[PDB]
Symmetry: C3
Subunit: 411 residues, 3 copies
Amino acid sequence: WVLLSTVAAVVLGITTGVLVREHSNLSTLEKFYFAFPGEILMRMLKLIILPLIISSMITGVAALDSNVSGKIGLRAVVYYFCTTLIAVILGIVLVVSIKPGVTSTVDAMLDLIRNMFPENLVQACFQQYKTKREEEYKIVGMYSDGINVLGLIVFCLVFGLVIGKMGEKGQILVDFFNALSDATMKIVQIIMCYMPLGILFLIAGKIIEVEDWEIFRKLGLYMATVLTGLAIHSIVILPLIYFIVVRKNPFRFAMGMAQALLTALMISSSSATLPVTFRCAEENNQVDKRITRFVLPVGATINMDGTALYEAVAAVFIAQLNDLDLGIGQIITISITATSASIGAAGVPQAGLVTMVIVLSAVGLPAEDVTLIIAVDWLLDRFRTMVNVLGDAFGTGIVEKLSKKELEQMD
Amino acid sequence: WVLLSTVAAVVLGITTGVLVREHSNLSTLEKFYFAFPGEILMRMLKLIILPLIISSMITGVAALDSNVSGKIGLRAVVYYFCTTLIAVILGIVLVVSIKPGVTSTVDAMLDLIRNMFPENLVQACFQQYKTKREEEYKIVGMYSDGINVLGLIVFCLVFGLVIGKMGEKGQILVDFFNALSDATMKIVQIIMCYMPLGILFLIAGKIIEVEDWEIFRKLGLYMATVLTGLAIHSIVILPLIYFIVVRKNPFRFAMGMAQALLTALMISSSSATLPVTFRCAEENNQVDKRITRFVLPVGATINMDGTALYEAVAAVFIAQLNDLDLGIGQIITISITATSASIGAAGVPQAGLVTMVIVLSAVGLPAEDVTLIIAVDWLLDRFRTMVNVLGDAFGTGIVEKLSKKELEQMD
Amino acid sequence: WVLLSTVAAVVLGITTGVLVREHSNLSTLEKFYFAFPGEILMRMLKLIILPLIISSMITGVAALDSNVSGKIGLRAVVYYFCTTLIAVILGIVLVVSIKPGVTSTVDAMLDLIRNMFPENLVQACFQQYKTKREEEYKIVGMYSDGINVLGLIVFCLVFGLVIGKMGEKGQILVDFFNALSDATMKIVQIIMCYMPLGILFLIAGKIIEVEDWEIFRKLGLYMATVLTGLAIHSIVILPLIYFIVVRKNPFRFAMGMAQALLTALMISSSSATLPVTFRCAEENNQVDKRITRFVLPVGATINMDGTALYEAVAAVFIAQLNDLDLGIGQIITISITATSASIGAAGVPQAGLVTMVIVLSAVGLPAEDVTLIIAVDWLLDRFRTMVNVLGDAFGTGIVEKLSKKELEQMD
C-alpha cells in the first residue's frame, strides 16, 4: 500500500507542479506557502530522530550483548559490520568519482573526535562543536547549531554496552528503552501516513521552481550510481569475500539462492522473505541448520548492505546538488551514520526515509532535498532488498567455514 | 487553610505596601530587592511546568485510553471537550469585546503549526520558532527563547496515545510517568507552601509602584468579565446544550441540582462534593445509576468549565494590562493551552496557579502579573467550582439520552 | 594499579615535556595538537558530570530516607554534614589567607539563590543565570553558558526526597535512578582507564609552556595548604568536637584508633579499612556494637572530611592560579558543591577527579588546570584517607553519648 500511495504522491505532485507553473504566476511568498505541508513533514521527521537514535542504539547494542552465541554469534556480527562498511566505502568512492549533481583538513578530523565526546549530553541533542584556526595561529571552538548525531551514537553505544553487562541491575533500563523504541517506532508509522500528503506538496514545490532539464539528468545519474554500486557489491565484492574464506566457487552459491532473490523482488521485504531463504540455503547450498537458525534471523534486520550503500550515495548526491564537496570530515560522518543506521532503525522498512534524515542531519545538509531521493526511491527499493538478502545468503556460507570446530563440538 | 493563608498574604501585602510607600523612599534598586522573595516564587513556578506538562499529558491521555467504556465512555469525553472549548471561546470573546486592562496574520497562524511539530524535542523545552516576512518577499525563522508549550502538548498527546495502545509492552512507560506525575505534584504542593510568602512580597512590590487608582478599576472590570462569563455559561450555554439533545426543560434539571451547587460553594472543591452530587442527580433528576457512576467520577477532574473560561480571561487581561493585543496566533495558543489544562493538572486544586503560568508562558506574557490574578482569585474561586460541577451535572442528563441503546442492552 | 599508572603518567609526562621543549621548537599550533589527547579527556570528564550529579543526588538522598534509624540514624547524618562543612570552611579560610597561586557583592549572593531555582530544568544542564547592575540603577539577567550545578543539586535533592516519601508509588523511580547511577559509575571507570594517557599529554603540554620555576613553588605551597588543613582538622577541630559533647579526653580516643589509621595509609581506601576499624573501635575504645554497626558502614562512603577540605583548597588554588579572587558568591558555590560531593560520588574512590571537575564547573574555572592537582594527588591521597576514617572513628564516640537513652531502650 505504502508504495502505491507514494507513487501516487509523486505523480500527483508532478501533475500539480505543471498545472500550477504553466497556468499561474506565484511570487516568492506564495511558493513558500504552497510547500508548507511538506515543511511540516520535514520537521516531523527531525522531531523523531532524537528519541529514535537514543532508543534504538541502547536497545540494539544491549540486544547484541545477549544474542551472541559465543564464536558463531561473534563471527556473524563481525561479518555484518565489514560488508556494511565496504558497501558504504564503495558508495562513497562511486559518488565522488562519477559526481552526479555537480554543474584545514586536520581541524576537520579533530572536530570529528571532539564531537564523538561532547562536553554535555543535553547540548549534544541540538548543538555541534566546530573549531576554527585563526590568529603563529590559534584555535577557537564555537558550538554551532544542529544535532550532534555522532555524540549520541557513541554515548548510547557505550551506555547500551554497559547495561547489557549489568544484567539484573540494569534490566529496568533495558525494559525502559525497549518500550521507548517501540513507542517511537509507532510514531514513525504515524508520520509515514502523513508522508504521502507531505511529499505531494514538496515535489510540486520543486516542479514550480525548475526552469531547466538538468535536474532530471542529475537524478538519472544518481540512479545509475546506486545501481552501479549494487551491481559491484553483489557481483565483484560479495562473491570475492566468499572466495577469500570459502574456496567453493561463489557463483554456484549465488545460483543456489535464485529462488530467494526473486521473491525479494516481489515482496520487497528482507524480513518477509525469511521462510524462503531458510530452506533455499539448506536444500540447495547444503549449509548447516545450526548456522542458518542464527545468521539469517539476526541478519535480516542488521545486515543492510544495499541500504547502507544507497544512503551513502544519496547524502553526497544531496551535498553535490547543493554546491558543496564535504571535505573529508563530513565524509567519515556519512560513513559512520550510514553504517550505524542498521542498529538505528530497529528492523523496520518504514524508517528508510527517517534514516536518510539522520544522515543528512549528521552533516548539516538541507533535509528538504530528500524528496528527490523519495521520488525515485520506489524504483531502487526493489534492488536494495535483493542485495540485503544476498549478504545474508553469503553470510551462512562464510560463518560456517569459520566455525567448523563449533560444528564438531556442538553435537 | 490555603485560602486563609493567601487572603492573609494579600492583606499583609497591602498593609506592607502602604506603610513602605508612604513612610519611606526607595530607588529603582531597592524596589527590585524588595520584590525578590516573589521573584524566587516566579521561577519556582516556571521550573516545575516542564515536568508537569510532560507527565500529566502522557498519563492523562493514557488513562483516557483505559477509561473509555465503549460508547458511554466516548460520549462523556467528547462532551467534556466541547463545553470546555465553548467556555474558552466565550471567555476569549468577552475579554476582547469588553477589554478590561486597556488605557502578517498568515505568518502567525503558520507559526502555530510549526510550533506544534518542533524540529527538536530538547529545544522545545526552552525555545520557540518564530518566523519573519522580509526581503518579492522572503521568510526567515529564528528560534527565539521561551518554552514551546504547544510542541510538548502535541508530542506528549501522541506519545501518551501510543503507550496506551501498546499495552503490556509499554506498561513500564505508563508506570514511569505515573510516578513522575505523582512526584511533581508533590513538588507543586511544596511550592504552594512557599507561595504565601512570595505573594506577600510580590503584592507589596505592586502597591509601591502605583500612583493611580486605575489599576483597581481594571481589576474590578476583570472580575466583572469572569463573573459575566460564568453567568452566560451556566444560564445561557449549558442549559441550551441540554435542550438541543434532551427536550426536557433544562432549568428543572438545574433546580434538581440545587443541593449540589450550594455545597460546591462551602467546600469549594469539585472532587470533594462528589458523594452529594451522586445522590442529588439520581434521587431528584431520575438519571440512571450506570451513567452516573462513570460521568461524575471522571468529570470532577476533567470537566473544568469554570477554570478554563477564567484562565482564558485572565491571560488576555494580562496581555491587555501590559499593552498588547495578541493578534490571532496567540489567541489560539490561549485556547489550546487553557483547554488542555484539564489534563495538564492531574485533578488537583493546588495547580490552579501553575496552570495560569503555563498559559502565560505559552504566549510569552510576563508571569509576574499573576499576582493581580491571585489577589482576587479567592473571590472568584467559589463561583468557578459551582460551574465546574454544573457541567458535570448537565453531563449525566446529556450522555444518558445519547446512550439510550446502551441501557437496554447492558441489562 | 591506578596509582602506579598515574605516577607513571606524571613521570613520563615530565620526561616527554623536557625532551620536547629542549630538543625542538613548536609554534602555538603544534602545542595545541600536542595536548589534544588531554583535551579529549577534559571533555569526557565534563560529559559524565551531568548524569553523575543527577543520579547520585536522587539515589543518595532517597537512600538516606531509608537508612535513618530514628534518632541514631539522624544524629550520624547530622554529624557527617557539620564536620564536612567545617572542613570546607577551614579549607576556604586557609587557602584565602595563605594564597598559594597568586603572583556588587549583593548581586552575587542573589545570583546564588536565583541559580538554585532555575527557570527551566533543561537549560540548567547547560546555562547559568548571571545578573548585571546597570542603568537610579536597573538590574538585567543574561543566562550565560556553563552547567548550573546548584540548580541540579537543589532540584535532585528535593526530587530525591519526594520519591523516598512516596514509597511503593515511587519505587520505579528509585529503581530507575539506581540503575542509572550504577551505569554512569561504570562509564566513569572507563574514562579512568583512558585517564593515564590523557594526563600524560596534558602534563607534557604544561612542561612545554613554562619558562619559570614559579609554578613549582606554587604547587609546593598548595600541598602545604592541604597538609596544614588536614593537620588542623585532625588535631584541633575533630578532637574539640569530641570534647564538646564527650568529656572523655579525645586524644586517648585517637590513640585507640592507631591500628585503623596506619592501615588507612597502606590500603589508602576508607571503605576497605572497615573490618579493621570496626574491631579497633570496640576492642579498645569500648564503644557500643549497636552504634558501630550503623555509623561506620554509612560513614565510610558519606563522611569524607579530608576529601571535602582538599577539593575546597584545590578549586580556589586554581582560581588563584588563573588570576581571579572569586568574590563571595563563588566561594559559597565551592562550599556547597564540595560538601555535596559526598553524595554526588556514590562511594567510589575513582570519582575523586570527576568531583574535582564538578567543583570547577560549578564556578566556571578552567578544567584543564586539574592536571596540576592530579600530578601531586598521589602524594596527598594517602593523608586524605587517614582523615576520612578519623572523622568516622570520632563519630562512633560522639553519636553514642548523644544516644544514651536509645541504648537503655533498645535492649
